[PDB]
Structures are given as C-alpha cells and as structure tokens.
Design a protein around this nucleic acid. Structure first.
Ligand SMILES: *OCCCCCCNc1c(NCCOCCO[C@H]2O[C@H](CO)[C@@H](O)[C@H](O)[C@@H]2O)c(=O)c1=O
Ligand SMILES: *OCCCCCCNc1c(NCCOCCO[C@H]2O[C@H](CO)[C@@H](O)[C@H](O)[C@@H]2O)c(=O)c1=O
Ligand SMILES: *OCCCCCCNc1c(NCCOCCO[C@H]2O[C@H](CO)[C@@H](O)[C@H](O)[C@@H]2O)c(=O)c1=O
Ligand SMILES: *OCCCCCCNc1c(NCCOCCO[C@H]2O[C@H](CO)[C@@H](O)[C@H](O)[C@@H]2O)c(=O)c1=O
Ligand SMILES: [Ca+2]
Ligand SMILES: [Ca+2]
Ligand SMILES: [Ca+2]
Ligand SMILES: [Ca+2]
Ligand SMILES: [Mn+2]
Ligand SMILES: [Mn+2]
Ligand SMILES: [Mn+2]
Ligand SMILES: [Mn+2]
Lengths: 232, 232, 232, 232
DNA sequence: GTAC
DNA sequence: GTAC
DNA sequence: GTAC
DNA sequence: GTAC
C-alpha cells in the first residue's frame, strides 16, 4: 500500500475506528486512526483556513484550523518524517463523503518546502482552472467551477453527492528530506468551504504527503477520507 | 515540431545560420536564427550568471549575462509570448557540443512565474542530486557530480566531449499566460561554468520554454543547441 | 525640495496643469505634469488594484490599474531612475482631496526590491493596525479603521472630507539602485477603494519613491496629491 | 533596561556566570545565563551558518549552527515570546571581545517574519555597503570592508581588537506577535567568520530581538556579548 | 584547553 | 460648476 | 448531536 | 581550421 502522512479535518465521528465523539482535526501517520486529535468547531457554509507546519529541527507536525472571529483548533505530534516518508514525495488534498455528505471545496492552496545547508519549492493557487496541468486530479476531483477545486462530486443543482472520493496532487515530486540537509522545512495553507444540506456533514478534507505514485485506495469513500485502504 | 522560446549563450559562431562572428547571447523565437543578439565576452573556466526576465505589461524578453568584475552583456526583444507559446509550458536548460566542445556545467538554477489578479510557482536549485525527481533529464544531461548539473558529457577527470546534447526540464508544467490575468511575469537565473581545452569552445547553453511534451530534436548536437530540428 | 517619482491614480482633471479631460493614470518624474498618462475608468465605490513594476535592464516604469471584470488601464515611460532618484529612498502611498473629495482607502500594500549580482527587501500589509510602527504616517493618514489605511480624512459614518492630504511611508530606507548591481528590480501592488457622494470625485492616490527625508509639501492638498510643492 | 531574547554563539567559557566549560550555543531569555545550551565545535577561520526559527503554534525557539562537512550543533527552548517581548521589536546581530578577541565578521544575514489569519517582512543582505541606511550600527560595528559587516573592531593590518562591542539592527520595527494572529513565525539565517590569532578566541556573536529603542548596555564588552548590563 |  |  |  |  501507499505511505501516507496527513492532517485530517474530520467532520464526522466514526467512534468504531477510534474517532472522538465530535468533529476533530488529527495527525494521521500511516493510519486513519489519528496519533493525535483536537476538537474542531466546524462551521457549516463558512470559509475556513488550515495551516500545516513541520521542520527537521523540532520534528513536530503541527496544524491550525480557523474561521474568522472564532477560536482556532490546533494539533501537534512529535514524529521524525525521515523514518516515515520516502525522500521524494507528492503533496496533495483529499476528501470524501459516505452515507452523509458535504461540499469539499478548496478555494486556495499554497505549499513551500526548503532544504538548507538552499533548495526551495513554492506553489500558490488562488484560482483553479478547467485544465490545470500542474495538478494531478484523482477520483471525483474537478477544477474550474467558480475557479475552485471541488474534491468530491457536486451535482448540477449544487448539492454534494454521497459515497464520493477525490484528491489533487501537485505535479512535481517534492524532496521532503535529505541526509546531508542541516535544516528541512515545509508549510501548507489551504482555504475550504464545507457545506451540507443534511443535519450531519461527512466525511472531511485532508492535506497529505505520500509516495510519488500514490493513488486513491479502492473503496476509501466515507471514513477512510480517500487516504487508507482500511481502518487499521 | 516543438515550439521553442530561448535565450542562447552561443559560444561558437556558425556564420551560415546568421550567428555574428563572435560569441554572443541571443533571443530565439521558434528559430536558431536569433531575432536579436549581443556580443558576449565568454570567460573560459570562469563561473558566469544569466538572468532572464519577461512581463505581460512590457511584453519584452530580456537577458543579462555577467562574470564577476567584468561588464555584462544584455539583449532584449519585444515579443508577445501569448501569441508564440501555448498557455502551459515546461521550462528548461539545454546545451550541446559538436566538432568543438566545452563543459556545460550548471551550478544553480532558479525560476519564478506569477499570474496576477495571484497564482505563483518558484523553484531554486543550489544543489543538484544524483536522482533528482523534480527534473526531467534528456540526452546526455546528468546530476550529482559535485552537486552540479552537467548538461553535456564530461569524462571522470572533467574533460568535455564532442557530439553531445543534453537538457534538464522542471517536472511541473508552468502556466505561462492566461487570457484573464492582469499581469503575468517570469524570471530565471542560472550560474554556469563553460571550460574548453580548444582554441574555440562550442556550442553553448540556452534557457528555454517549450510545449510540455518537448524532447531533444533528432540530430540537434552542435549549432542547434538541443532546441531546433534544423537551422530554418 | 524633495525628489519624487510617482504613479498617480488621478480622479480629477486639472486642465491648467496638463491633466487630460478624464480620470487618468500617470507617470510623474519630479513634476505633477505627468510625463505619460492613460485614460482610467475609475469605478466609484469599487475595490481596485494597482501594480507598478521597474527593472534596470529595460529602464521602463510601468503600471496597470484594474477592477474585477473590467478592462485594465496601463501606462509606461522609459526613464533611467539611476539618474533621477538618490541611491537610497523611501517608498510610500499619498492621497489628497481639495474642493471635491473621495475616500482614499488602502486595503492592502506590498513592495519588493532586489539588487542582483542578491540584496532583497519585501513587505506585505493585508491588515493595517492602529499603532503600526513600520509605517511613517504623514498629514491626515490614519490606520486601524476596519484594518484599512485611510490616507485622507473620513468621518465616523465613512464620509470623505475636502481639503485633506495624507501619506504612509515604509519605515526602512530602500536601496533602489547600486552602480555595481547587474540587475535591480522593484514591484509594488496596492488595493484601494475610492468612493464619493460628489458628481466629481477628487483628487487621487499615488504610489511614490522619494528622498528618505521626504515630507508632505506645504499646501499640497487637491491637485498636487501630497507630492509636489507647486504645479511646475 | 532593555528586553532581550537572543541566540548566542559563545566562543569563550565564563564558568563564573554559568557558561559550560566549552564553546557553546545558547538561548538567552532576558539573561546572559542561557536557559539552554549545546556544545559547539567552533572552527577558527572557517565560514559558519546559523539558522534560528520560532512559530506561535509550537512556541519553541530553536537554532542550528553548522560548518561545511561537520556535524551541526542545535539548541531549543520552549518559551512563549508573547509573554517576554513587546508586540513591536527590532532584530539585530551583536558581538563582543574582552581580554581575548576574535573577528566577528558577518558575511550574510536574512530574516523573515509573518503574521497570518497575512502580514510579512523579509530582508536579505548578501552584500553590506559603506553607508547602509537600512541598518542601525551601534558601538564598533562597521559595514563595507570586503562587503562584510564587522561587528567588532578590526585594525588596519586585519587583527581583531580586545574590549570591543558592536551591533547592527534592521531599521524597520518588526511586528513579532499580535493577539488576533492565528499563526506568527520568524526565521533568521546568518553566515559568520570568527578568526583569532590567539590560542583562545572570545567572546562570540548573537542574533537578538529587543525593544525597538534598544542600545548597547554600557560596559557590555567581553562575556556580556553587547546584550546585557550585568551577568545576572 | 592546558598546565600546575 | 462657474467665469470669460 | 439528539432521541430512545 | 580548411576550402574555394
Ligand atoms: O458532532 C456530533 C455529530 C454526530 C453525528 C452522529 C452520526 N450519526 C449517525 C451514525 N453513526 C454511525 C456512523 O456510521 C454510519 C454511517 O457510515 C457511513 O457513513 C459515514 C458518513 O458519510 C462514513 O464515515 C462511513 O464510512 C460510511 O460510509 C449513524 O448511523 C447515523 O445516522
Ligand atoms: O583552428 C580551430 C579554430 C577555428 C575554428 C573555425 C571557426 N570559424 C568558423 C566556422 N566554421 C564552420 C562551422 O562548422 C565547422 C564545424 O561544425 C561542427 O562543429 C561546430 C562546433 O561544435 C558545430 O556548431 C556544428 O554543428 C558542427 O557539429 C564558422 O562558421 C566560423 O565563423
Ligand atoms: O458641477 C460640479 C462638477 C464639475 C466640476 C468641474 C470640473 N471641471 C474642470 C475644472 N475645474 C477647475 C479646477 O479647479 C476647481 C477646484 O479646485 C480645487 O478643487 C480641486 C478638486 O479637489 C483640486 O484639484 C484643486 O487643487 C483645488 O483644491 C478643470 O480644470 C476641469 O476639467
Ligand atoms: O574550549 C576551552 C577553551 C578554554 C579557554 C579558557 C579560558 N582561559 C582563561 C581564563 N578564564 C577565566 C575567564 O575570565 C578571564 C578573562 O575575562 C575577560 O576576558 C574574557 C574574554 O574576552 C571576557 O569574557 C570577560 O568578560 C573579560 O573581559 C583566564 O583568565 C584565561 O587565560
Ligand atoms: Ca471520521
Ligand atoms: Ca553557434
Ligand atoms: Ca488632477
Ligand atoms: Ca561566554
Ligand atoms: Mn478522525
Ligand atoms: Mn547564435
Ligand atoms: Mn494628472
Ligand atoms: Mn554562554
């Protein structure tokens, strides 16, 4: 299977696989069962912002998710990604729906990675286009509708669909660690709009780092968030 | 055939294709017969720097090539690249040798492209590694020798070889123009070491922008600099 | 007197100082009598964006001013700023009102300057705060009202006042040119909201570069845009 | 007195004030008696690189100091700078000599600070000039000798002097924290050349953050590193 | 960091 | 929008 | 997240 | 550096 490190914005509690009883953010290291979670007050229909940071000095993967004029949710986990990820990776966004659904709309995404002694990569999307050749779209993901990235299927009348999964990966491989680097760092930011007509939205959005040849695991709709083939 | 826009650092005068009778820099728009040239005092065995700039306001492609403590050479050409290049491109470095030879050594390469009212791409290579997954190497190009990119063949003691052609392209496609952008800009910088035992070094280095699926044209050693299928 | 280079967004035609008979953008080199202008379709109450670019290769000062879903206005002027500006400068925004008035509201401001073969300066304000220590406020300029910079006087209900002039300069001096630099470049971007109850809004906003010790010239409300001591 | 946070590169053990018995790097919070230290293998006459990082999510001040082809020294300390520094600060480099001496030569310095919800400041000096108006020089500090910043006094024959102190601060105040920011971060990098003709170099170099109006404490030569008025 |  |  |  |  793929090697996945992810930050999940998990809108739907799957208590059977160790989710807390509330919408949460989490740090996922090679398992959908987060190594760490924080409670997340997800605001239906509101634009939120996720910030993800890591550096090879502290070896601490951290995230902050916020809405205008509300308290942030934050989660951190000590992990040496040199011992988890391959040296070269792709970075991406993933989302899913299941029996419950939501829009998984990405309005902007930026990423920066640096290896110092310096090598750098930076991309910034504030606008997504119909045929965006620097993104690899997988599954139900589409670009160009209102200049946004729709990770999961939305009908012609604007309703999100159930049992949908989709992902967007940046086209170039990323050099995420190097044995001779004195300092390696990355940061990701994205803005998102999760909207549900139902009482209960599902399933969430994740930022993820994977082996370069990563693909959506077959059947990874719902609680698997397009990242894992099973709930182990 | 491919669509090529290039800045050539041309070390060898080919009078039969309209080169001036001296080493020169040139702007190549879909032809090896530069639309504009400037005399270039190439310093055998010295590290040089090339800077290439363009913006959609001025629609003027400019370059400056310099050595420490010497006068620069500069060339500019008015061209609307919206009417020349496809909307999505790859960017790259190319170099060649023929009967006469030189090292085509790249010590660093950086590139930035922005499409405003903003989408942005930036990469910086100060170190090239043996298995560099965000570069597409074509022909004779190799990476990892002293952390440098050798575009053309060099022996184990660093002696350049004749009849050699090689290129390196950044892996991700670049969105070089967009009809709704108010301002689009790019800039490229690279540092290079051209060294020859020959009285006459040949053939040169180019920065280029191509169709995404561009490859080294058949036979394009020597004066065609790995860019053009013929001298038309 | 001061040495001023400016891009004016001139909302009010002053025919006696050589303004065209319509709102215009202009390039001002040491005079309010623009060296070049372009017609500008200013949209009362809409947020606009101004982009200003210059590099020492082309020696061409350009600007583009845009509103969402409208055609841009653009103006360029060939000028070697090495022979106009002192080596060290301050950068700023200026605005004024006279008999006629408008809001001169700045919603964001960014600036980058680089001197290559590299020295670099960059700032980005997306939020202005009440006591913003990296800005020098001159005249009527105030910060903190909805996180915006109000260059000229506005009442508590947001109504602009006549006979008002105000400027904001970045605190640090900027090294705008250097005799040994191979390439020097700057770019500025700001977003603005010009709103008037008047049939005729006045007087405009400018981005400017000055001697470091520049101050609002005595009497420079109205047509002199807080930049010039007289209309020569 | 001033409020100082610093990363010290301490070349000289002052065991009487709690230095370890070896050259060390340290994190100094309002005291020259480091809250944390790591052993540092300082290489006389070699160019080294210091990297300093902090973000408001982890609240961890970290540094890495390295030489080509040697193991790094690294030190980290958990501190909430919101409770230590004022909201607006200056950033700087400091160095001293005492009865023992060394060159305190700075070859490059870069800094980036961001406040997100984004406001940014970045500067990069690869070249220092004789009259560098975006630096505040204090004490014995000079710029322009070989394009370098000499923090402490060097004689006409190139010998460092004893009992010398000097500092360089960036001219613009820096907004280091804000109560409404979701994420605040900074990073500094500098390269340095410490050379001594004596068996024993002294006293060291520091990166520091201070109140905006900070000045060299009188008598802060030697072990006080130009930062503190006393050894408490 | 080495010598008494 | 008023003054020649 | 609320109802049995 | 050789060919017309
Ligand atoms: O903030 C508190 C909100 C609580 C919502 C409670 C959930 N309601 C609920 C459950 N719980 C059991 C969960 O699994 C049943 C559905 O499983 C399928 O749907 C989800 C959501 O798309 C997905 O994660 C799974 O993989 C699967 O597709 C109900 O049965 C019910 O109603
Ligand atoms: O004595 C040796 C130094 C003088 C060399 C001659 C330079 N003068 C000159 C030529 N020569 C004709 C060019 O073609 C000759 C070789 O062509 C092959 O090699 C070159 C160099 O690598 C390459 O560009 C060609 O594609 C081919 O591979 C002029 O035109 C001129 O001036
Ligand atoms: O009915 C009201 C709308 C029409 C207004 C007239 C515009 N036409 C016009 C003028 N007028 C002469 C300019 O000076 C008049 C006022 O001058 C003062 O106010 C302006 C605006 O704030 C300011 O620029 C001046 O400095 C002074 O404070 C033309 O020349 C033209 O065209
Ligand atoms: O890596 C191991 C190297 C060990 C070096 C040992 C130091 N040698 C030494 C000492 N130690 C006592 C320290 O204070 C005496 C000098 O104090 C003055 O000089 C220093 C250095 O510039 C400065 O920090 C102080 O503030 C003061 O100016 C000796 O006495 C001796 O020899
Ligand atoms: Ca879940
Ligand atoms: Ca040639
Ligand atoms: Ca006017
Ligand atoms: Ca010490
Ligand atoms: Mn979960
Ligand atoms: Mn040529
Ligand atoms: Mn005007
Ligand atoms: Mn110490």
């Amino acid at each position: 299977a793929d090697t996945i490190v992810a930050v999940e914005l998990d809108t739907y509690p799957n208590t059977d696989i160790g989710d807390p009883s509330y919408p949460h953010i989490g740090i996922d290291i090679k398992s959908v069962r987060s190594k760490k979670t924080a409670k997340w007050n997800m605001q239906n229909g509101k634009v939120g912002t996720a910030h993800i940071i890591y550096n090879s000095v502290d070896k601490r993967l951290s995230a902050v998710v916020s809405y205008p004029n509300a308290d942030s949710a934050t989660v951190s986990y000590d992990v040496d990604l040199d011992n988890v990820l391959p040296e070269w990776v792709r970075v991406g966004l993933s989302a899913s729906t299941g029996l419950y659904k939501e829009t998984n709309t990405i309005l902007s995404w930026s990423f920066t990675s640096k290896l110092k002694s310096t090598n750098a990569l930076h991309f910034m999307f504030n606008q997504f286009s119909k045929d965006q050749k620097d993104l690899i779209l997988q599954g139900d993901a589409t670009t160009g509708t209102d200049g946004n990235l729709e990770l999961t299927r939305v009908s012609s009348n604007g309703s999100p669909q159930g049992s949908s999964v989709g992902r967007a990966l940046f086209y170039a491989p990323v050099h995420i660690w190097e044995s001779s680097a004195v300092v390696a760092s990355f940061e990701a930011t994205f803005t998102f709009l999760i909207k549900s007509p139902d009482s209960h939205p599902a399933d969430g959005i994740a930022f993820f780092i994977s082996n370069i040849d990563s693909s959506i695991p077959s059947g990874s709709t719902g609680r698997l968030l397009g990242l894992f083939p099973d709930a182990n």
